[PDB]
Write a protein that binds this DNA or RNA. Structure first.
Ligand SMILES: Nc1ncnc2c1ncn2[C@@H]1O[C@H](CSCC[C@H](N)C(=O)O)[C@@H](O)[C@H]1O
Length: 327
DNA sequence: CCATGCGCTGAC
DNA sequence: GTCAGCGCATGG
């Protein structure tokens, strides 16, 4: 994450739905906003959340009575994506874990926050010939909100990972917010190689497979793109190796393959997957964030999470729009 | 639970 | 064509 001088969200309360690791919490708090409610049903996720924020999030949002949720100014929600991801089945709203947006909508209908800040995978935008997105848009509008949506790639915001996510910012209509803008992209000055842990701390992650196929030579100059240096097996998900002079591929929650959830990287002559701390870093999490003790659970958590830096820029721009109240 | 080989969709 | 994806299924 980065340092935020002007705390644009000072005095604003927000809720952290589908909390996960609390990325939205890191982002909005860094802007001066106060978290007054969190909800996350996964046992282990609740563990890390509590480990870092000192409170356990409420469980199953589908059973939470909308009316019990504390009044708030900004509702934050990076809802489930398995039902929309390009990597899954794409069953959408007809999937058990694909109807959560309606719970969010049910909550908004009752508490009318000033802002609804949501996030989901890039494929969400084009899913089901845009109807899924349209549904969200129309739902937001009927609730009397503007709807601002855009896919932003983490690589354009200072983090070496090609995580393309759609962000939807909605402002309550009576606020007449006409100046909201998604942050402008800037040059990448950080690469995978710059976030790695010392070799001593990561030897156990080295996999020596006899089927490594060097598809491309390592590169001498750093580049803001994912450079595949080779595959293993059939080169499917979890079986591709990339240059550390480039950027990280998208971290995943239930990803498979020998380099599950992080992908392989050619490091100082060797081939290995990322360590949970490196995943923390690739997601913009500060080194002070305590990762969950179970590696498998930490890999999953980070793969489901958000890039803090991107949220901090957006969160700042939401605050800028809210503060412009001239006579 | 943890590990892994998918095996296809979508974006160009 | 080329190649990457907050995934799935199945083994133990
Ligand atoms: N019905 C439900 N009630 C509460 N939490 C739920 C839920 N269904 C899914 N979730 C949780 O919502 C999350 C979606 S992924 C969101 C990650 C979060 N943005 C972060 O910063 O890490 C997962 O942690 C999942 O366990």
């Amino acid at each position: 994450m980065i340092e935020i001088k002007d705390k644009q969200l000072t005095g604003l309360r927000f809720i952290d739905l589908f909390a996960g690791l609390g990325g939205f919490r890191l982002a909005l708090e860094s802007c001066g906003a106060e978290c007054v409610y969190s909800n996350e049903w996964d046992k282990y996720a609740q563990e890390v959340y509590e480990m870092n924020f000192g409170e356990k999030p409420e469980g199953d949002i589908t059973q939470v009575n909308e009316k019990t949720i504390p009044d708030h100014d900004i509702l934050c929600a990076g809802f489930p994506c398995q039902a929309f991801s390009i990597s899954g089945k794409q069953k959408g709203f007809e999937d058990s874990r694909g109807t959560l947006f309606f719970d969010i909508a049910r909550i908004v209908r009752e508490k009318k926050p000033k802002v609804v800040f949501m996030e989901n995978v890039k494929n969400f935008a084009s899913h089901d010939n845009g109807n899924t997105l349209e549904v969200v848009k129309n739902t937001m509008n009927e609730l009397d909100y503007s709807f601002h949506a855009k896919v932003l790639n983490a690589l354009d915001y200072g983090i070496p990972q090609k995580r393309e996510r759609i962000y939807m910012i909605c402002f309550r209509n009576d606020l007449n917010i006409q100046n909201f803008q998604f942050p402008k992209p800037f040059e990448l000055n950080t690469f995978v190689k710059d976030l790695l842990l010392p070799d001593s701390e990561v030897e156990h992650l080295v996999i020596d497979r006899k089927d490594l196929v060097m598809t491309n030579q390592e590169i001498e100059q750093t580049t803001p793109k994912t450079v595949r240096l080779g595959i293993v097996g059939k080169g499917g998900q979890g079986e591709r190796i990339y240059s550390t002079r480039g950027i990280a591929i998208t971290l995943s929650a239930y990803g498979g393959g020998i380099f599950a959830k992080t992908g392989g990287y050619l490091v100082n002559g060797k081939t290995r997957k990322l360590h949970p701390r490196e995943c923390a870093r690739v997601m913009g999490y500060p080194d002070s964030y305590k990762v969950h003790p179970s590696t498998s659970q930490a890999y999953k958590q980070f793969g489901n999470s958000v890039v803090i830096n991107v949220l901090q820029y957006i969160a700042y721009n939401i605050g800028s729009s809210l503060n412009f109240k001239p006579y």
